[PDB]
Design an enzyme around this catalytic site. Sequence first.
Site, PDB file in Angstrom:
ATOM      1  CD  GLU A  63      28.678  28.912  19.388  1.00  0.00           C
ATOM      2  OE1 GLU A  63      27.840  28.490  18.606  1.00  0.00           O
ATOM      3  OE2 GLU A  63      29.898  28.947  19.093  1.00  0.00           O
ATOM      4  CE1 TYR A  64      27.669  33.110  20.888  1.00  0.00           C
ATOM      5  CE2 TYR A  64      25.530  32.586  19.899  1.00  0.00           C
ATOM      6  CZ  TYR A  64      26.904  32.812  19.791  1.00  0.00           C
ATOM      7  OH  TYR A  64      27.470  32.675  18.561  1.00  0.00           O
ATOM      8  CD  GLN A 120      51.244  16.005  23.406  1.00  0.00           C
ATOM      9  OE1 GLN A 120      50.453  16.720  24.004  1.00  0.00           O
ATOM     10  NE2 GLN A 120      52.552  16.278  23.322  1.00  0.00           N
ATOM     11  CD  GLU A 121      54.518   7.677  24.439  1.00  0.00           C
ATOM     12  OE1 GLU A 121      55.230  11.596  21.926  1.00  0.00           O
ATOM     13  OE2 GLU A 121      54.275  13.483  22.521  1.00  0.00           O
ATOM     14  CB  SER A 145      25.233  20.852  17.735  1.00  0.00           C
ATOM     15  OG  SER A 145      24.850  21.437  16.498  1.00  0.00           O
ATOM     16  N   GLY A 203      31.955  22.843  23.379  1.00  0.00           N
ATOM     17  CA  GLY A 203      30.599  23.358  23.144  1.00  0.00           C
ATOM     18  C   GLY A 203      30.346  23.576  21.664  1.00  0.00           C
ATOM     19  N   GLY A 204      30.180  24.839  21.253  1.00  0.00           N
ATOM     20  CA  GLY A 204      29.754  25.080  19.888  1.00  0.00           C
ATOM     21  C   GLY A 204      28.218  25.057  19.784  1.00  0.00           C
ATOM     22  CB  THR A 208      31.616  38.335  13.056  1.00  0.00           C
ATOM     23  OG1 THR A 208      32.930  37.863  12.728  1.00  0.00           O
ATOM     24  CG2 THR A 208      31.723  39.159  14.379  1.00  0.00           C
ATOM     25  CE1 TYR A 209      29.235  31.086  13.387  1.00  0.00           C
ATOM     26  CE2 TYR A 209      31.457  31.889  13.748  1.00  0.00           C
ATOM     27  CZ  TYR A 209      30.394  31.089  14.114  1.00  0.00           C
ATOM     28  OH  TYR A 209      30.519  30.337  15.289  1.00  0.00           O
TER      29      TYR A 209
END
Length: 515
Positions: free
Chosen positions: A251-252, A181-182, A211, A208-209, A319-320
């Site tokens: 997904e999913y 972080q720093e 792909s 994830g996502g 929802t897309y």
Amino acid sequence: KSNLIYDKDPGYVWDNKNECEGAAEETYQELNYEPSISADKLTWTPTRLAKTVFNTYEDDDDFNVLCYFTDWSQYDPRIINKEIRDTGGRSADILRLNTPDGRPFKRLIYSFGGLIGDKKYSADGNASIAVRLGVATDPDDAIANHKGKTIPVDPDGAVLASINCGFTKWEAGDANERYNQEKAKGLLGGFRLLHEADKELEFSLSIGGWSMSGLFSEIAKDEILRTNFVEGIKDFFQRFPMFSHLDIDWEYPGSIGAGNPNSPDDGANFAILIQQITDAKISNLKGISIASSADPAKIDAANIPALMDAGVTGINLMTYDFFTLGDGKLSHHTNIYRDPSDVYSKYSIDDAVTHLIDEKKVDPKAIFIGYAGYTRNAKNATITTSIPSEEALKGTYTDANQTLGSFEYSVLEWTDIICHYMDFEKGEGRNGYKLVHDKVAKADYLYSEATKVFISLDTPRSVRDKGRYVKDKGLGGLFIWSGDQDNGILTNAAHEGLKRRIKNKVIDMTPFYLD
């Protein structure tokens, strides 16, 4: 004269020069993009063409607005000099979110962390990335000792970059040195700059996502892989103490997604994994969210009950993308409602929400619904609705390969919309396009008789109505996919639909809703 857009790419000042004034329009010239004619082109429009207009609103009610921020949206090789103009990047500055006196989102979600061993996404299962980040000693070690461990898959964009991440000068240091972080630059350093300006802002990692869901089914079945996965979470949360949430966007579970291994036992296995992460007692991890399809059949397959029984605290309902090319019928892509017999718009937020609450007994407050910073289009399209102003969208298309978009065929992004497709200030379409409100779906679309291109998009009006739906139904809130696309108009509408009192007013939203 506009409060929403620039008439010319203002460029980007880097190392005391501005090499990209008018770059967006030079690309358009090189590619022969013309908004009122082009049906089959990419624009490459950078977000720089939009003016930044996020208001802030009191957000201490019982709802939250979340932001998926993608770590590839910062790029644009046009920034550096005059050499590259036949392609470009989004150039999305993380600093557009640095508002005075509040925040446009409660929680920023870093998109995306990948997984070591994921050979669907990466020819070497991300092993070279693991070495570069300093979490593995060589590629053999990465796979042999760390399969299932999460890491950002773009170390430049995550921890090194300056441009669009809030930093102003190149400095020596490799990714291994900056993977905390720093010392971070990149988008994680940009998240830190927002953290430092605003102590109430929350940070989530999304793993994830679409792909990068290829490895989940395999991991969740296996106790050693689950254990590596939990170690991945502990490591990242130790390196970046400012993070407090986790979005595991598999997904999913239980279905095909992008072409992944999958099993009926996925949801039950995923529930073991979520419990195992909880059991690690990572002191800064306060909540775990998961992804859900909006298709009730895919919801059934995911075993949502198992996941809620393991203590999941949020469901990001995706929802897309309800409009997918292939079946020759037009569709809204992110609409709240549909007629149950609708064969064009086959999915809706409401069908999915109803399914989760009524059939799967999910707590409504756990559910977050999506609004979209981009469109789903088809060229060669015909609107067949009899009275478009009063009836549900119906329509067809023939050959939609290579349809108009911004960075990938068939998808325009928000900047293109407000600059070349819709004039929300004048209340009407641009360049031969007309905006139609579909009262059955409560969603808008754009269509040009001249180009025959159909464009399904969210608007201030629909996003406001999504905020209204969330409030009426007592849901958790909304997220934007993805927030890097928004110049602030979409997110303003969300807060207004939640009935939030404005705190800092940059723009008056009133005329942009058009009744």
